[PDB]
Amino acid sequence: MELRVGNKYRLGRKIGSDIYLGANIASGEEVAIKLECVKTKHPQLHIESKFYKMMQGGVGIPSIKWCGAEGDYNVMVMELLGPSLEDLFNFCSRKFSLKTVLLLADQMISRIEYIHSKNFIHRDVKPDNFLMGLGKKGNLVYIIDFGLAKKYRDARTHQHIPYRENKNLTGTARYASINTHLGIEQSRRDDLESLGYVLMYFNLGSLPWQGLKAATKRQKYERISEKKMSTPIEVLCKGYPSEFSTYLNFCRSLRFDDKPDYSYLRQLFRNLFHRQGFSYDYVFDWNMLK
């Protein structure tokens, strides 16, 4: 007993949901480690490693440290990362200050942009899929889990994929864009609409269509769709800086194969940030006393 992997790493205690902690036999430096039985009836390790492998180089993308197999286990060793924004959100009693939301909004938009610049759309943007970094990168928002990512434009030609309908819901319902509820293929615009809901979710502690009484996954998704539909943005964002409405309105208007003006969007919020007098010092809410 006492399992090593890649001849450099020692397996450690479970640390998430399964991710294991691991260390470098020599330095003690810590890493994360996923394993997958070569006989799973639900592979995911490969795809995921392929993404980090492809997106390698991008900021906020977890770095792959080793890919291989050990016994009947497929093993991936990656840089260790911090808690997800949903965890830190709970740490802060499910409420983030404007300053925190804006610091997050800035990096989360760039993160999404990067993926789009690589021909894929995420399709499951939500607090759970964003993690802070460690040490030096502790002030960095990382994006993860590409289990639903999908190519939206030719590598070479940049030919966008076809517009198409009667598409099944494919991410979290709570954060899905209107169009996705309507069954339309997803494209860049939706990743950004979703962030828009994520952000308002942080502002409010919850979304009006959250916790909706249903009796069937089909029924539930229904109610959410109708509910999201009947909440106009100016109402949703009532009480908060209009920048947020300008944001969702913009996203909701992009044409299926449009290219979002990412800069417009960061700018939008960066201006609000400054008007309020905040400093880009990275003192997020979960960094302060409670």
From Swiss-Prot:
Outcome when changing residue 252 to L: In a lung adenocarcinoma sample; somatic mutation
Tissue: Expressed in all tissues examined, including brain, heart, lung, liver, pancreas, kidney, placenta and skeletal muscle. Expressed in monocytes and lymphocytes but not in granulocytes.
Domain Protein kinase: 9-273
Membrane-spanning intervals of the chain: none
Protein name in UniProt: Casein kinase I isoform epsilon
Gene Ontology cellular component annotations, sorted alphabetically: cytoplasm; cytosol; growth cone; neuronal cell body; nucleoplasm; nucleus; ribonucleoprotein complex
Family from the record: Belongs to the protein kinase superfamily. CK1 Ser/Thr protein kinase family. Casein kinase I subfamily.
Positions that bind ATP: 34
Keyword NADP listed: no
Keyword Phosphoprotein part of the UniProt annotation: yes
Catalytic residues, chain numbering: 124 (proton acceptor)
Localization per Swiss-Prot or TrEMBL: Cytoplasm; Nucleus
Activity control mechanisms: Phosphorylation leads to a decrease of the catalytic activity.
Protein's job: Casein kinases are operationally defined by their preferential utilization of acidic proteins such as caseins as substrates. Participates in Wnt signaling. Phosphorylates DVL1. Phosphorylates DVL2. Phosphorylates NEDD9/HEF1. Central component of the circadian clock. In balance with PP1, determines the circadian period length, through the regulation of the speed and rhythmicity of PER1 and PER2 phosphorylation. Controls PER1 and PER2 nuclear transport and degradation. Inhibits cytokine-induced granuloytic differentiation.
Catalytic activity entry: L-seryl-[protein] + ATP = O-phospho-L-seryl-[protein] + ADP + H(+); L-threonyl-[protein] + ATP = O-phospho-L-threonyl-[protein] + ADP + H(+)
Upregulation: Down-regulated during granulocytic differentiation.
GO-annotated molecular function: ATP binding; protein kinase activity; protein serine kinase activity; protein serine/threonine kinase activity; RNA binding
Post-translational modification: Autophosphorylated. Partially dephosphorylated by PPP5C. May be dephosphorylated by PP1.
EC number in record: 2.7.11.1
GO biological process, one term: negative regulation of Wnt signaling pathway
This protein's UniProt keywords: ATP-binding, Biological rhythms, Cytoplasm, Kinase, Methylation, Nucleotide-binding, Nucleus, Phosphoprotein, Serine/threonine-protein kinase, Transferase
